[PDB]
Write a protein that binds this ligand. Structure first.
Ligand code: HEM
Length: 153
């Protein structure tokens, strides 16, 4: 359970993201795909992209980055009271998209890196720890839904 002070640190940096949701989503997906190429393989939509320049030039990738970060922002702004938002996401990622929990760890690392690059003055260690806790809570709660459905592994 995050404290109120931890949530404030999380949402204070997240308010900085929402000024350029699409730029952040591009940086985060690109980092994810470069760092963990098995992730790119889960998107039939993106698997033709073979270079970082092609990734940066894809408008469809930029659109998906906004989809991802819009859903994550709505979950973070619930400060843990996020059951209604996670249900459908856990269900589609477990049963349709077939995304292992481990890849949610990977995208959490990319999010943290990109926030540190773009917002260092609002993403010192206290805020990095709080955002780590928030993303761990996200993963923990998705993992319990996966386990229900037979996908925790
Ligand atoms: C912060 C974590 C993530 C969030 C908030 C998120 C959110 C979403 C949303 C809102 C959609 C569209 C609606 C739906 O299908 O449920 C989507 C689709 C999808 N996601 Fe995620 N996602 C996350 C992580 C991942 C990761 C790590 C992968 C793969 C490695 C992934 C793979 C996919 C795929 C394959 C689709 C369908 C894309 C398409 O072909 O249109 N997601 N995601």
């Amino acid at each position: 359970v995050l404290s109120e002070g931890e949530w404030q640190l999380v949402l204070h940096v997240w308010a900085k993201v929402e000024a350029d949701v699409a730029g952040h989503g591009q940086d985060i997906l690109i980092r994810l795909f470069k760092s963990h190429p098995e992730t790119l393989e889960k998107f039939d939509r993106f698997k033709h992209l073979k270079t970082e320049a092609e990734m940066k030039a894809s408008e469809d990738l930029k659109k998906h980055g906004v989809t991802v970060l819009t859903a994550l922002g709505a979950i973070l702004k619930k400060k843990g009271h996020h059951e209604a938002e996670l249900k459908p996401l856990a269900q589609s990622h477990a049963t349709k998209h077939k995304i292992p929990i481990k890849y949610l760890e990977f995208i959490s690392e990319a999010i943290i890196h990109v926030l540190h690059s773009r917002h260092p003055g609002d993403f010192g260690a206290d805020a990095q720890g709080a955002m780590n806790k928030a993303l761990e809570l996200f993963r923990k709660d998705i993992a319990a839904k996966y386990k229900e459905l037979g996908y925790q592994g």
